[PDB]
Symmetry: C6
Subunit: 222 residues, 6 copies
């Protein structure tokens, strides 16, 4: 009566609203506007995995250099430089088949099953039509599932209440969709987290407030 | 005073609001946003048919592999692998004339009159103009009606309250239209099912709540 | 002080709100979203004419086969097969000059003055620009007026409260415009009928509810 | 302190809200959706002029034949056929320089200073860019002013509360702009008339109700 | 603590809300929909300057002939023909480098430092991209500032509450922006004047009502 | 637990809501509509730096000449001419690699670590696609970070509540985003300042009123 296994992301409150955490072997799409916490979410997923379960991670980035990410993480107190030196964490700088080959090579070398992709929207900006975007996204998700590494891919969206992704096709390809919203009402911004869908497993429905503190993302499972 | 015959879908509450179930020999278009339950609807239609009436089914999929669908079904407790091995269910992996020929060949081989199409939107993404989309959709619906197999085709739409399909032409070709809506109000999502039209037979008018539980879709015929 | 003659459509309540029925020799444009009753309106116009005034009719269809229309009509109790066999009704299957020639040939052969066109939108989908759409629509309307047969042409529109037709030019060519709206409010759908204009004769202003029952369209002239 | 002369249109109530009627020698743009009364306005202007001041008129039409206009006018009791036979009224059927030459020739032949243009939007549909539309409209208005005949040109607009014309450039070329609106509120339509501007003379500001009765347009100058 | 000099426009109430009038040597962009008073504003600026300070002016027009402008001005009681004959006012008929050369030649010949441009939108209609529009507008503004003549350039906008100009780039090039709005509420139109910005000097913030009377524009500095 | 250093902008109240001021070595994007205070913000940043910390600055401008900026600054009482003569301030007139080379040359020559860019939107207007805009913006930001000079780049946006930049990609490239809004409500304009994000450091959330007085921008840290 159950055939889905989940690995805990160890993010405070996210496992409660995801009913066990992120499913193992499936690629999640985390979408939100600028300043919501996509990069922080993808960094904290890998960092918590490495700290708790001793499971290494690979963080592929396109819009940032590794040093900037390390400084932003040390802002929270996470010494990612020590993890990179010890080999428990890998950071890949690519700034599509070659990217998948490099990710697979890193996964095999570091014996890591956890992947975070900071910006696939920047990669898809090169392509023109949304059909090609869907094809490339499906190819990447299929390769990630074949490898067997749980992946958190973050994409950018324009409007707080509108299409889940700018192209509008990301929501219909990824197995799991998580949405971060920075809603501006009454001249004040509020952060909300929503689990749009989880193919093959139950999850909470609605939006729940969360705060980006000095220790990382903290979701309130009200 | 009546010349329309209907086969029960055995979905809890859907037959009550459809006034006898899905008409026999006509192709339905089930449209909704991501995470509403189109794939689950198409899977449950075939599974309930096979279990109750011993009527085999063919499930043609484009955006997923058969193994993923089997795992997602086993999440509900449906052992689709046993049905596939016994021959009471067929799953087709195509990832347009060749597709119709393959569907007809499967129908003839398995002596099955029930077809589910998980994503024709992905197929239509290749075409550019909406006129070509209408032509291909009409060709597929005509072939399905000529074969005589009741079909449930699922398409993707962007906005909860907007065009029935992304191209806007699907609603005017399919004989029957069913709409699943995932409405986000008050930072909470609500699932609703609507029967937009049934060419040649009566149906309930409006939208009715439904829930995706661990046993499948359950519609409340209030 | 009057130079306009009208033939009664015999639709329950439509003659009351049209102040005498559809004008003779002019082509009406019946526009509405999917599931509103355009095809049923065009079928009932011809059927009521044949039954009451013994005036034969021609029903030209593009998106459907004659057999499907006959079955949908028999759902209401209308034995259109008997009328077709007796010659009192003709059904034309075209699935633009050749179409007009065929319609004129059918009109001359069957001595019928009543024409219904189920989908000119599908024909206009081939053309690209709205100017060509306007030119073709004007040509068809002029030919219909020259023939002298009262015509009911049905077109498709996307939004309940928006452009009268998808191209936006149909309203400015046809002499008479009738609008069927399927308004979704409070998670319930309501059917309304409106007479946008009647060139050269008075009509009621506003929208009136109507219901599609088992006997056909029934408008309430409140 | 005044250098503008006005000719009364004799339309009931329009002269009161226009403060003396339509200015002499300037071309008006009457814009409204379908079924508002543009064609009736242009016909009644010429008919009232001919009846009262014995000043002949020229009515150039593109979307209709003269016979249809004559029948629609006789619906109100206006025997335009007698006026055409007597030479007090001319009707031109053109279905851009040649059009202006023909209008000037008719004006010279019939010694008439009053012109109505039923559809310049249909003519402008041939052109692609709005700059060409503006150029052609300015050329026509300049030619009409050089001839010295008061002109009422009617154009089509899509939305009740939106751009004054479909192209959006008509309002900035014509000296005078009149807007007819058919507002649908509470499932009921209401007719309103507005004078957007009169270059060089004062006018009432706002919108006033008007009714199309069996005698013609009747505006209430509240 | 101050390095900006202003010349009074002598328009009733505009100097109060502009805190000293239009800055000397800078080009203003006056934007509004049709019928708001852009042409009247540009005419009254020059006329008041000539009458009060004996400072001649140049009025360059594109959408109108000089005679029409003279008649519209005489509607208010302004005998612009006498001023043109005396040489205290020049009217230029151009219906982009040649235009600037002609304006400079007129400025040098008539020893005038005041320029009004009635329609640069019509000139920019020839260009396709908004980048070229920005380049040409910047070139014209730079030439006007180099000449040293205070200029009032009027542009056309479509929506009452939307982009300041149709192209959306005029607001970011001109040093000073004034907006005239004709707001339609409650079936009544209200005229409002706003000073969007004044580069290098203070101004009132908000919108103030104004009326176009028989003596010209009159702003209420509430 | 902290690896981010900040240099105070000395703007009244901005350091309080930014929690220490602008981060050192990162490029900020200040976005707002016309008349909000982007140019004044970029000028005041450099001027306050030079006055307080004796840290020279470079102001690169595209839409204005240096003399106009000097006059607008002297409107506030800032004698930028004296600073330019003394060498404590440099103003660059460029009216993309050559621009970066010139900025680096100025930085090296004047031993200044502070840069303000008045209009990169005008530069990006030359490019067509938003992908090229993103690439050029990322290149410029990377070069600025490599140089090590704190930069304030100002971009233009159309709608008060809409995309952060006109292209919609600026918000996802710059490390820090500040938004100035000129909200028109009740026929009155209100100025608000918001810090959308600060990569790697905390900041206040919401919008706070600010006023452009005769001494410069003054933000109220309520
Ligand atoms: N130490 C911290 N304390 C609090 N908030 C922090 C801290 N460090 C970073 N942030 C938050 O990080 C946010 C922006 O950084 P983040 O990495 O989340 O960006 P993002 O949403 O992924 O951006 P993008 O869309 O450009 O990829 C800011 O809103 C800020 O509040
Ligand atoms: N065992 C389960 N219990 C409850 N809900 C489940 C279960 N398995 C799946 N779901 C539901 O399935 C939904 C998504 O899966 P589903 O197959 O319905 O997608 P879909 O709407 O067809 O997607 P797409 O638009 O990508 O084709 C989630 O919202 C989740 O709630
Ligand atoms: N026997 C019946 N009793 C009640 N309603 C019926 C019956 N037969 C058909 N209908 C109605 O017919 C509607 C759809 O069929 P119809 O022929 O009116 O479509 P349509 O609006 O012309 O479609 P399209 O836009 O695709 O041309 C349904 O909403 C259904 O309620
Ligand atoms: N005798 C009449 N009594 C009342 N109303 C009439 C009469 N004759 C015509 N009408 C009115 O004429 C209107 C449509 O005809 P009209 O000539 O005004 O069209 P229009 O607005 O110019 O159309 P288009 O946009 O297609 O050019 C209808 O709304 C109808 O009410
Ligand atoms: N003597 C007058 N008394 C009152 N109002 C007048 C008078 N003369 C002209 N007007 C006003 O002039 C307005 C239109 O003329 P105006 O020159 O202001 O047009 P505009 O806004 O510049 O037009 P466009 O956008 O076509 O350039 C009308 O709304 C009218 O009220
Ligand atoms: N001395 C001053 N006192 C008050 N406000 C001033 C003063 N000088 C300039 N301003 C303000 O400057 C604003 C416009 O100048 P500013 O340099 O801020 O433009 P901006 O927003 O950068 O423009 P753009 O979008 O064209 O680049 C006006 O709204 C005005 O109120
Ligand atoms: Mg980020
Ligand atoms: Mg699915
Ligand atoms: Mg139909
Ligand atoms: Mg008309
Ligand atoms: Mg004007
Ligand atoms: Mg500025």
């Amino acid at each position: 009566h159950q055939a889905i296994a989940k690995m805990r992301t160890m993010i405070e409150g996210f496992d409660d609203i995801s009913h066990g955490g992120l499913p193992i072997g499936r690629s999640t799409l985390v979408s939100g506007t600028s300043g919501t916490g996509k990069t922080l979410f993808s960094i904290q997923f890998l960092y918590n995995g490495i700290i708790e379960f001793d499971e290494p991670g690979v963080f592929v980035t396109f819009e940032e250099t590794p040093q900037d990410i390390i400084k932003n993480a040390r802002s929270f107190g996470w010494d990612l430089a020590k993890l990179v030196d010890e080999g428990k964490l890998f950071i890949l700088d690519a700034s599509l088949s070659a990217l998948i080959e490099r990710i697979n090579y890193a996964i095999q070398k570091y014996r890591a099953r956890r992947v975070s992709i900071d910006s696939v929207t920047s990669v898809f900006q090169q392509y023109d039509a949304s059909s090609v975007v869907r094809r490339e996204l499906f190819r990447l998700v299929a390769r990630l599932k074949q490898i067997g590494a749980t992946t958190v891919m973050t994409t950018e969206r324009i409007e707080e209440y509108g299409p889940i992704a700018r192209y509008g096709v990301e929501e219909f390809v990824s197995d799991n969709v998580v949405i971060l919203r920075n809603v501006l009402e009454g001249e004040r911004r509020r952060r909300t987290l929503e689990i749009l869908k989880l193919r093959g497993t139950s999850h909470m429905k609605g939006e729940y407030p969360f705060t980006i503190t000095d220790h990382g993302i903290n979701i309130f499972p009200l």
